[PDB]
Design a protein around this ligand. Structure first.
Ligand SMILES: CC(=O)N[C@H]1[C@@H](OP(=O)(O)OP(=O)(O)OC[C@H]2O[C@@H](n3ccc(=O)[nH]c3=O)[C@H](O)[C@@H]2O)O[C@H](CO)[C@@H](O)[C@@H]1O[C@H](C)C(=O)N[C@@H](C)C(=O)O
Ligand SMILES: Nc1ncnc2c1ncn2[C@@H]1O[C@H](COP(=O)(O)OP(=O)(O)NP(=O)(O)O)[C@@H](O)[C@H]1O
Ligand SMILES: [Cl-]
Ligand SMILES: [Cl-]
Ligand SMILES: [Cl-]
Ligand SMILES: [Mg+2]
Length: 439
């Protein structure tokens, strides 16, 4: 694409917006940047030559633009951005800018849960085959920073927000892993509007990898000749549960006994199936892809044991930012004593009621904090405490922890009401777990 001489306006002074500033400046185009927040996090990292506007969107700049580049955190429905769209001004995101430049095949992964795990697994499968791979997107490395003439494969984690502003993605293989309620504060037409955003990932994809157990993952006009499926008891890629033993199978053939994996849990076995299906579709050798499933140890903040001491496990699942993710932590969870569950933050208008069925019985205590703490404590008030902060909650629960207990941060909410990012939340939990749970 050619941006020379164009009036380019970037919305959002966070990670994405800064990556876009650098992208345009490296091509000789000086953009302008705006953000609705008075003091956005990237403000002090912005090059001195770039004009900036904070505290609101600037309609003089938007209506003058030839190209608007919207960070995923700004809604297209914002009245100023909707007005620019009504005037026919082109609006794209960083993923669109990336797709217009990329010169290697793209594997594209979305879904409500499991995206970073599957994205990282496909990257590891590529590395095991000796492929120069770039892994990024919503996982936290902005995609424009991956562009490299020597890269042989890109693996992108994509959010619904990023997909809304993307029109030129033609993935070699694309998946929606699952669709469960999230981001409802951004989707006022509800679950099907959120789904519609994700369904964009399949447009012009060579192979679509769908979840046979989740009908909302199937393409917009229905499953077609491009579609390969994964699932538990059915699918092209599926599981088989022998006597105390689980295998990954592909079209009637065993490929891996999951005892060789370092991850566990049925949802991680279906994540492994989805990753294998994507890698197969990208042409990666099966043997090296299977090897990578056995070496991958998991990601920080995803059901991460940060301390095991005195018979207590302290588990950082800060990446559980929606109900479905916390459900995956609780479903089938084994705790010898009491589960001390930390819930809270920015609930994004979620209905938390699906969690209540996991919170019965005599061995569960809730510690609820942040913006929506009260709504979480209402799941079962008789076992719940509410604090302002996670630190207060941890200092409250720590004296009550007995050998055999589990302390689980799986908050079902985003972190931005009180933290810079979910990593800061998990890191603070880990620091407090070490202080309160160790000698
Ligand atoms: C909210 C979102 O989409 N965040 C992703 C984004 O990070 P970045 O720092 O660029 O975010 P952003 O677009 O600046 O938005 C962050 C926050 O700033 C707020 N914001 C942003 C712009 C603005 O003018 N005003 C404003 O108030 C947004 O409402 C949002 O709450 O780009 C990064 C690189 O692609 C992603 O790693 C990061 O994923 C984070 C982990 C995330 O929470 N993603 C969501 C979608 C999710 O996983 O559920
Ligand atoms: N298939 C799955 N279904 C449900 N939850 C999952 C699945 N895979 C992983 N998780 C959980 O989802 C959370 C995040 O995992 P990750 O692989 O980072 O997914 P994400 O899509 O990048 N983020 P999120 O939207 O919070 O799941 C963790 O709490 C995982 O335990
Ligand atoms: Cl250019
Ligand atoms: Cl079998
Ligand atoms: Cl967050
Ligand atoms: Mg999300």
């Amino acid at each position: 694409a050619d941006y020379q001489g164009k009036n380019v306006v970037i919305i959002g002074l966070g990670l994405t917006g800064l990556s876009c500033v650098d992208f345009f400046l490296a091509r000789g185009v000086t953009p302008r940047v705006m953000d609705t927040r008075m003091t956005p996090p990237g403000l002090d990292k912005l090059p001195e030559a770039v004009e900036r506007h904070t505290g609101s969107l600037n309609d003089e700049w938007l209506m003058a633009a030839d190209l608007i580049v919207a960070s995923p955190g700004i809604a297209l429905a914002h009245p100023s951005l909707s007005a620019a769209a009504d005037a026919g001004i082109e609006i794209v995101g960083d993923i669109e800018l990336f797709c217009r430049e990329a010169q290697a095949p793209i594997v594209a992964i979305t879904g409500s849960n499991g995206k970073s795990t599957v994205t990282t697994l496909v990257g590891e499968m590529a590395k095991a085959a000796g492929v120069n791979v770039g892994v990024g997107g919503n996982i936290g490395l902005p995609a424009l920073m991956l562009l490299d003439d020597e890269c042989e494969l890109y693996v992108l984690e994509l959010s619904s927000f990023q997909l809304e502003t993307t029109s030129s993605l033609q993935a070699v293989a694309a998946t929606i892993l699952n669709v469960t309620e999230d981001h409802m504060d951004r989707y006022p037409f509800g679950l099907q509007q959120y789904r519609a955003a994700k369904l964009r990932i399949y447009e012009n994809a060579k192979v679509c990898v769908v979840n046979a157990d989740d009908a909302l993952t199937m393409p917009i006009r229905g499953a077609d000749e491009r579609c390969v499926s994964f699932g538990v008891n059915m699918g092209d890629y599926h599981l088989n549960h022998q006597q105390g033993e689980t295998w990954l199978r592909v079209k009637g053939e065993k490929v891996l006994n999951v005892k060789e994996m370092k991850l566990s849990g049925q949802h991680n076995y279906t994540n492994a199936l989805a990753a294998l299906a994507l890698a197969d579709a990208a042409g990666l050798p099966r043997a090296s892809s299977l090897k990578a499933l056995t070496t991958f140890t998991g990601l920080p903040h995803r059901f991460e044991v940060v301390l095991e001491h005195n018979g207590v496990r302290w588990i950082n699942d800060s990446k559980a930012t929606n109900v479905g993710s916390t459900e995956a932590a609780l479903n089938g969870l084994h705790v010898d004593g009491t589960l001390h569950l930390l819930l809270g933050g920015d609930g994004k208008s979620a209905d938390f009621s699906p969690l209540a069925r996991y919170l019965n019985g005599d061995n569960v205590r809730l510690y609820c904090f942040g913006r929506d703490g009260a709504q979480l404590a209402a799941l079962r008030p008789e076992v719940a405490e509410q604090t302002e902060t996670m630190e207060q909650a941890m200092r409250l629960l720590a004296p009550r922890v007995q050998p055999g207990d589990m302390v689980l941060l799986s908050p079902a909410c985003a972190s931005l009401d009180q933290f810079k990012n979910f990593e800061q939340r998990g890191n603070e939990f880990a620091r407090l777990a070490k202080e309160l749970g160790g000698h």
